[PDB]
PDB file of C-alpha atoms in Angstrom:
ATOM      1  CA  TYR A 514      -0.285   0.448  -0.007  1.00  9.81           C
ATOM      2  CA  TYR A 515       2.907   2.101   0.537  1.00 10.81           C
ATOM      3  CA  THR A 516       3.736   2.752  -2.760  1.00 14.02           C
ATOM      4  CA  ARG A 517       1.216   5.855  -2.955  1.00 12.99           C
ATOM      5  CA  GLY A 518       4.352   8.099  -3.080  1.00  9.00           C
ATOM      6  CA  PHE A 519       7.500   7.463  -6.112  1.00  8.39           C
ATOM      7  CA  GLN A 520       5.157   9.159  -9.136  1.00  7.77           C
ATOM      8  CA  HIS A 521       6.405   6.807 -11.856  1.00  8.99           C
ATOM      9  CA  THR A 522       5.194   3.556  -9.714  1.00  8.89           C
ATOM     10  CA  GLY A 523       2.252   5.416  -8.795  1.00  9.86           C
ATOM     11  CA  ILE A 524       1.162   6.570 -12.224  1.00 12.90           C
ATOM     12  CA  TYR A 525       1.264   3.414 -13.406  1.00 11.18           C
ATOM     13  CA  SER A 526       0.015   1.531 -10.192  1.00  9.15           C
ATOM     14  CA  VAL A 527      -3.258   3.134  -9.709  1.00 10.34           C
ATOM     15  CA  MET A 528      -4.236   2.021 -13.051  1.00  9.93           C
ATOM     16  CA  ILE A 529      -3.478  -1.453 -13.460  1.00  8.96           C
ATOM     17  CA  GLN A 530      -4.912  -1.896 -10.155  1.00  7.97           C
ATOM     18  CA  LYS A 531      -8.594  -0.482 -11.384  1.00  9.03           C
ATOM     19  CA  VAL A 532      -7.641  -2.618 -13.984  1.00  8.90           C
ATOM     20  CA  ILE A 533      -6.945  -5.697 -12.526  1.00  9.07           C
ATOM     21  CA  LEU A 534      -9.603  -5.490 -10.107  1.00 10.44           C
ATOM     22  CA  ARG A 535     -12.124  -4.876 -12.545  1.00 10.41           C
ATOM     23  CA  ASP A 536     -11.429  -7.644 -14.668  1.00 10.97           C
ATOM     24  CA  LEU A 537      -9.639 -10.534 -13.103  1.00 12.18           C
ATOM     25  CA  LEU A 538     -12.412 -10.492 -10.757  1.00 13.91           C
ATOM     26  CA  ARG A 539     -14.377 -12.625 -13.887  1.00 12.30           C
ATOM     27  CA  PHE A 540     -11.697 -14.834 -14.661  1.00 11.35           C
ATOM     28  CA  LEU A 541     -10.836 -17.378 -11.587  1.00 12.96           C
ATOM     29  CA  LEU A 542     -14.540 -18.311 -11.398  1.00 14.11           C
ATOM     30  CA  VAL A 543     -14.732 -19.653 -14.239  1.00 12.73           C
ATOM     31  CA  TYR A 544     -10.986 -20.824 -14.620  1.00 12.70           C
ATOM     32  CA  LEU A 545     -11.655 -22.747 -11.226  1.00 10.78           C
ATOM     33  CA  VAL A 546     -15.225 -23.966 -12.606  1.00 11.91           C
ATOM     34  CA  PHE A 547     -14.196 -25.641 -15.947  1.00  9.54           C
ATOM     35  CA  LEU A 548     -11.173 -26.834 -13.304  1.00 11.58           C
ATOM     36  CA  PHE A 549     -13.856 -28.198 -11.525  1.00  9.00           C
ATOM     37  CA  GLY A 550     -15.858 -30.035 -13.857  1.00  6.97           C
ATOM     38  CA  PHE A 551     -11.881 -31.647 -15.449  1.00  7.50           C
ATOM     39  CA  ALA A 552     -11.361 -33.288 -11.926  1.00 10.37           C
ATOM     40  CA  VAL A 553     -14.846 -34.703 -11.445  1.00 12.68           C
ATOM     41  CA  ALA A 554     -14.688 -35.925 -14.621  1.00 13.48           C
ATOM     42  CA  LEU A 555     -11.396 -37.638 -14.881  1.00 12.00           C
ATOM     43  CA  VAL A 556     -11.762 -39.324 -10.847  1.00 13.73           C
ATOM     44  CA  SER A 557     -15.077 -40.855 -12.739  1.00 17.76           C
ATOM     45  CA  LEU A 558     -13.716 -42.264 -15.465  1.00 19.91           C
ATOM     46  CA  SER A 559     -10.921 -43.511 -13.739  1.00 20.58           C
ATOM     47  CA  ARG A 560     -12.269 -45.343 -11.268  1.00 19.15           C
ATOM     48  CA  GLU A 561     -12.865 -48.278 -13.007  1.00 18.91           C
ATOM     49  CA  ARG A 591      -6.484 -39.940  -9.264  1.00 17.41           C
ATOM     50  CA  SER A 592      -7.959 -41.847  -6.975  1.00 16.91           C
ATOM     51  CA  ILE A 593     -10.872 -38.921  -5.159  1.00 17.53           C
ATOM     52  CA  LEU A 594     -12.172 -35.866  -6.311  1.00 18.28           C
ATOM     53  CA  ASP A 595      -9.196 -33.962  -3.945  1.00 15.83           C
ATOM     54  CA  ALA A 596      -6.636 -35.068  -6.477  1.00 15.24           C
ATOM     55  CA  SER A 597      -6.878 -32.370  -8.640  1.00 14.68           C
ATOM     56  CA  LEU A 598      -4.091 -30.540  -8.215  1.00 11.99           C
ATOM     57  CA  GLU A 599      -3.275 -32.062 -11.544  1.00 12.13           C
ATOM     58  CA  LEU A 600      -4.617 -29.618 -13.771  1.00 10.51           C
ATOM     59  CA  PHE A 601      -3.045 -26.926 -11.459  1.00 11.63           C
ATOM     60  CA  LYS A 602       0.391 -28.630 -12.287  1.00 10.48           C
ATOM     61  CA  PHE A 603      -0.533 -28.541 -16.060  1.00 12.43           C
ATOM     62  CA  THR A 604      -1.106 -24.612 -15.421  1.00  9.32           C
ATOM     63  CA  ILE A 605       2.147 -24.585 -14.147  1.00 11.65           C
ATOM     64  CA  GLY A 606       4.199 -26.489 -16.053  1.00  8.35           C
ATOM     65  CA  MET A 607       3.762 -29.801 -14.921  1.00  9.05           C
ATOM     66  CA  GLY A 608       1.510 -32.388 -15.262  1.00  8.02           C
ATOM     67  CA  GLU A 609       2.750 -35.888 -16.433  1.00  6.19           C
ATOM     68  CA  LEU A 610       0.728 -36.504 -19.565  1.00  4.89           C
ATOM     69  CA  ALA A 611       1.745 -39.811 -19.990  1.00  4.46           C
ATOM     70  CA  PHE A 612      -0.545 -42.934 -21.028  1.00  4.16           C
ATOM     71  CA  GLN A 613      -2.256 -44.804 -18.012  1.00  3.40           C
ATOM     72  CA  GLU A 614      -1.476 -48.494 -18.628  1.00  5.28           C
ATOM     73  CA  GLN A 615      -3.451 -50.265 -16.665  1.00  4.21           C
ATOM     74  CA  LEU A 616      -6.804 -48.058 -17.104  1.00  4.24           C
ATOM     75  CA  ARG A 617      -8.239 -49.617 -20.928  1.00  3.68           C
ATOM     76  CA  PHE A 618     -10.045 -46.275 -21.423  1.00  3.11           C
ATOM     77  CA  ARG A 619      -6.687 -43.826 -21.527  1.00  3.25           C
ATOM     78  CA  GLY A 620      -7.059 -42.394 -25.308  1.00  2.00           C
ATOM     79  CA  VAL A 621     -11.316 -41.094 -23.620  1.00  3.37           C
ATOM     80  CA  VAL A 622      -8.492 -39.526 -20.604  1.00  3.16           C
ATOM     81  CA  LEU A 623      -6.214 -38.229 -23.323  1.00  3.29           C
ATOM     82  CA  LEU A 624      -7.993 -36.327 -24.983  1.00  5.05           C
ATOM     83  CA  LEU A 625      -9.650 -35.246 -22.402  1.00  4.70           C
ATOM     84  CA  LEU A 626      -6.755 -33.676 -20.780  1.00  4.84           C
ATOM     85  CA  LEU A 627      -6.778 -32.361 -24.873  1.00  4.49           C
ATOM     86  CA  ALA A 628      -9.157 -30.245 -24.242  1.00  2.00           C
ATOM     87  CA  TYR A 629      -8.720 -28.987 -21.403  1.00  2.00           C
ATOM     88  CA  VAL A 630      -4.701 -27.861 -21.948  1.00  4.17           C
ATOM     89  CA  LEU A 631      -5.671 -26.549 -24.918  1.00  2.50           C
ATOM     90  CA  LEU A 632      -9.482 -24.889 -23.575  1.00  2.69           C
ATOM     91  CA  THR A 633      -7.450 -23.052 -20.357  1.00  2.00           C
ATOM     92  CA  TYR A 634      -4.716 -21.509 -23.087  1.00  2.00           C
ATOM     93  CA  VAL A 635      -7.826 -19.969 -24.937  1.00  2.00           C
ATOM     94  CA  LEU A 636      -8.724 -18.647 -22.113  1.00  2.00           C
ATOM     95  CA  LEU A 637      -5.849 -17.224 -20.687  1.00  2.00           C
ATOM     96  CA  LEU A 638      -4.997 -15.800 -24.215  1.00  2.00           C
ATOM     97  CA  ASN A 639      -8.553 -14.194 -24.329  1.00  2.00           C
ATOM     98  CA  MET A 640      -7.205 -12.242 -21.061  1.00  2.00           C
ATOM     99  CA  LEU A 641      -3.617 -11.362 -22.366  1.00  2.00           C
ATOM    100  CA  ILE A 642      -5.753 -10.147 -25.418  1.00  2.00           C
TER     101      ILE A 642
ATOM    102  CA  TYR B 514      27.635  -2.382 -25.008  1.00  2.00           C
ATOM    103  CA  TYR B 515      29.514  -2.756 -28.705  1.00  2.00           C
ATOM    104  CA  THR B 516      25.706  -2.457 -30.351  1.00  2.00           C
ATOM    105  CA  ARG B 517      26.441   0.660 -30.867  1.00  2.00           C
ATOM    106  CA  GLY B 518      26.555   0.415 -34.809  1.00  2.00           C
ATOM    107  CA  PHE B 519      24.003  -1.178 -36.406  1.00  2.00           C
ATOM    108  CA  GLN B 520      21.239   1.439 -36.785  1.00  2.00           C
ATOM    109  CA  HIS B 521      17.908  -1.029 -36.865  1.00  3.43           C
ATOM    110  CA  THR B 522      19.025  -3.213 -33.641  1.00  4.67           C
ATOM    111  CA  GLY B 523      20.426   0.255 -32.038  1.00  3.39           C
ATOM    112  CA  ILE B 524      17.607   2.933 -32.814  1.00  4.71           C
ATOM    113  CA  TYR B 525      15.247  -0.532 -30.142  1.00  9.03           C
ATOM    114  CA  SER B 526      18.359  -1.164 -27.977  1.00  8.25           C
ATOM    115  CA  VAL B 527      19.230   2.229 -25.930  1.00  9.93           C
ATOM    116  CA  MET B 528      15.206   2.955 -25.737  1.00  8.38           C
ATOM    117  CA  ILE B 529      14.373  -0.582 -24.486  1.00  8.67           C
ATOM    118  CA  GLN B 530      17.281   0.168 -22.286  1.00  8.03           C
ATOM    119  CA  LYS B 531      16.023   3.029 -21.161  1.00 13.49           C
ATOM    120  CA  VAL B 532      13.453   1.533 -20.187  1.00 14.01           C
ATOM    121  CA  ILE B 533      14.544  -1.842 -18.738  1.00 14.06           C
ATOM    122  CA  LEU B 534      16.284   0.664 -16.020  1.00 15.82           C
ATOM    123  CA  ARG B 535      13.244   2.411 -15.236  1.00 14.75           C
ATOM    124  CA  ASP B 536      11.147   0.348 -14.572  1.00 12.75           C
ATOM    125  CA  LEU B 537      13.239  -3.612 -14.007  1.00 12.19           C
ATOM    126  CA  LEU B 538      14.944  -1.521 -11.067  1.00  9.88           C
ATOM    127  CA  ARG B 539      11.444  -1.294  -8.838  1.00 13.49           C
ATOM    128  CA  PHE B 540      10.521  -5.062 -10.184  1.00 11.00           C
ATOM    129  CA  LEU B 541      13.192  -7.336  -7.534  1.00 12.49           C
ATOM    130  CA  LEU B 542      12.826  -5.747  -4.754  1.00 17.11           C
ATOM    131  CA  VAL B 543       9.035  -6.221  -3.987  1.00 16.92           C
ATOM    132  CA  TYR B 544       9.734 -10.210  -5.481  1.00 14.78           C
ATOM    133  CA  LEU B 545      11.861 -10.523  -3.028  1.00 12.69           C
ATOM    134  CA  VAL B 546      10.646  -9.027  -0.153  1.00 14.77           C
ATOM    135  CA  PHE B 547       7.469 -11.425  -0.928  1.00 17.31           C
ATOM    136  CA  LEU B 548      10.099 -14.554  -1.172  1.00 16.21           C
ATOM    137  CA  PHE B 549      11.391 -14.104   1.844  1.00 16.92           C
ATOM    138  CA  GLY B 550       8.199 -13.651   3.564  1.00 16.89           C
ATOM    139  CA  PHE B 551       6.613 -16.911   1.899  1.00 15.44           C
ATOM    140  CA  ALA B 552       9.474 -18.462   2.720  1.00 13.84           C
ATOM    141  CA  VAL B 553       9.443 -17.710   6.404  1.00 11.35           C
ATOM    142  CA  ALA B 554       5.667 -18.554   6.906  1.00 11.11           C
ATOM    143  CA  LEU B 555       6.629 -21.852   5.197  1.00  8.55           C
ATOM    144  CA  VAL B 556       9.525 -22.625   6.962  1.00  5.12           C
ATOM    145  CA  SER B 557       7.665 -21.804  10.424  1.00  3.39           C
ATOM    146  CA  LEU B 558       4.872 -23.731  10.058  1.00  4.84           C
ATOM    147  CA  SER B 559       6.081 -26.862   8.326  1.00  6.02           C
ATOM    148  CA  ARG B 560       8.574 -27.166  11.399  1.00  6.19           C
ATOM    149  CA  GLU B 561       6.148 -28.891  13.410  1.00  9.55           C
ATOM    150  CA  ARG B 591      11.912 -27.122   3.701  1.00 11.37           C
ATOM    151  CA  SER B 592      14.054 -26.922   6.303  1.00 15.18           C
ATOM    152  CA  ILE B 593      15.514 -24.319   6.983  1.00 15.47           C
ATOM    153  CA  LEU B 594      14.630 -20.436   5.541  1.00 12.93           C
ATOM    154  CA  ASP B 595      17.180 -20.806   3.421  1.00 13.27           C
ATOM    155  CA  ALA B 596      15.515 -23.570   1.479  1.00 13.24           C
ATOM    156  CA  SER B 597      13.539 -21.002  -0.899  1.00 13.23           C
ATOM    157  CA  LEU B 598      14.812 -22.744  -4.076  1.00 15.51           C
ATOM    158  CA  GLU B 599      11.070 -24.255  -3.914  1.00 13.51           C
ATOM    159  CA  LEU B 600       9.261 -20.692  -5.150  1.00 13.91           C
ATOM    160  CA  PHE B 601      11.992 -19.834  -7.698  1.00 13.31           C
ATOM    161  CA  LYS B 602      11.528 -23.982  -9.456  1.00  9.70           C
ATOM    162  CA  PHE B 603       7.527 -22.768  -9.040  1.00  9.14           C
ATOM    163  CA  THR B 604       8.253 -19.079 -10.820  1.00 11.82           C
ATOM    164  CA  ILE B 605      10.337 -21.305 -13.318  1.00 12.19           C
ATOM    165  CA  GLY B 606       8.125 -23.614 -13.745  1.00 14.11           C
ATOM    166  CA  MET B 607       9.234 -26.355 -11.219  1.00 16.61           C
ATOM    167  CA  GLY B 608       8.138 -26.359  -7.670  1.00 18.70           C
ATOM    168  CA  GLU B 609       6.894 -30.028  -6.775  1.00 16.84           C
ATOM    169  CA  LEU B 610       3.749 -29.326  -5.456  1.00 16.83           C
ATOM    170  CA  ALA B 611       2.052 -31.896  -4.508  1.00 16.73           C
ATOM    171  CA  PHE B 612       0.727 -32.642  -0.359  1.00 17.80           C
ATOM    172  CA  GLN B 613       3.077 -32.683   2.433  1.00 15.94           C
ATOM    173  CA  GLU B 614       1.582 -36.343   3.472  1.00 17.63           C
ATOM    174  CA  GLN B 615       3.703 -36.183   7.510  1.00 16.50           C
ATOM    175  CA  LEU B 616       2.583 -32.341   7.911  1.00 16.84           C
ATOM    176  CA  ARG B 617      -1.010 -32.109   9.948  1.00 19.85           C
ATOM    177  CA  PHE B 618      -1.486 -29.105   8.460  1.00 18.94           C
ATOM    178  CA  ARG B 619      -1.107 -29.721   4.461  1.00 16.71           C
ATOM    179  CA  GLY B 620      -4.375 -27.743   3.371  1.00 15.17           C
ATOM    180  CA  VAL B 621      -2.505 -23.969   5.075  1.00 14.75           C
ATOM    181  CA  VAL B 622       0.389 -25.028   3.227  1.00 15.23           C
ATOM    182  CA  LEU B 623      -1.481 -25.586   0.452  1.00 15.31           C
ATOM    183  CA  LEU B 624      -3.509 -22.449   0.833  1.00 15.53           C
ATOM    184  CA  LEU B 625       0.544 -20.441   1.267  1.00 19.37           C
ATOM    185  CA  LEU B 626       1.770 -21.897  -1.522  1.00 16.09           C
ATOM    186  CA  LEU B 627      -1.466 -21.130  -3.867  1.00 19.16           C
ATOM    187  CA  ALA B 628      -1.690 -17.401  -2.457  1.00 20.97           C
ATOM    188  CA  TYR B 629       1.729 -17.173  -3.187  1.00 20.61           C
ATOM    189  CA  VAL B 630       1.824 -17.983  -6.998  1.00 20.20           C
ATOM    190  CA  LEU B 631      -1.107 -16.039  -8.007  1.00 21.97           C
ATOM    191  CA  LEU B 632       0.651 -13.083  -6.550  1.00 20.89           C
ATOM    192  CA  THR B 633       3.308 -14.000  -8.234  1.00 20.33           C
ATOM    193  CA  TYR B 634       1.348 -14.571 -11.256  1.00 20.99           C
ATOM    194  CA  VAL B 635      -0.814 -10.647 -10.852  1.00 20.08           C
ATOM    195  CA  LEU B 636       2.427  -8.593 -10.274  1.00 20.80           C
ATOM    196  CA  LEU B 637       4.515 -10.450 -13.195  1.00 20.17           C
ATOM    197  CA  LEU B 638       1.118  -9.061 -15.376  1.00 19.38           C
ATOM    198  CA  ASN B 639       1.116  -6.276 -13.664  1.00 18.75           C
ATOM    199  CA  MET B 640       4.417  -5.680 -15.007  1.00 17.76           C
ATOM    200  CA  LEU B 641       3.819  -7.000 -19.042  1.00 18.42           C
ATOM    201  CA  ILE B 642       0.902  -4.317 -19.079  1.00 16.90           C
TER     202      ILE B 642
END
């Protein structure tokens, strides 16, 4: 908060704060909704990632990690791969939209 | 320094140097302050990451690594996860602010 002085910082800081408060508040909701939906779909498909709380994989994907590979024992591996691809393209598209 | 010639490079180089010297000098301070605060909080919470010098995890997070996962033996795993989420959103927001 104490960046009120130092004009060179403040001129940009106030306007970027206004922009962020106006815009980013409508990102986290939709991204979280999509993440929860995809996590529920994955845990429901993989039961035959063991619990709903194991949604950290999507966060690893959006931060860089994720370990995208075949699941071997899961027979419906193609469907899981397609779901992961859909999720990654969707989140990249959404972040591109925010950036623009 | 020897890029003074080669006009096509220099026209952009001088102005981008001025911009960087004016702007980036007020990023590393605040980012380092937040990183140190979060590292101290994590090491203080996890004592019951073993030392203050183990702040490299946040740098791994900001470069792509980080190994975001449950800590098992640490009972207050939810608080640690919430702190990590707060830190990652904070640093992404700060870098977005710089970019804009």
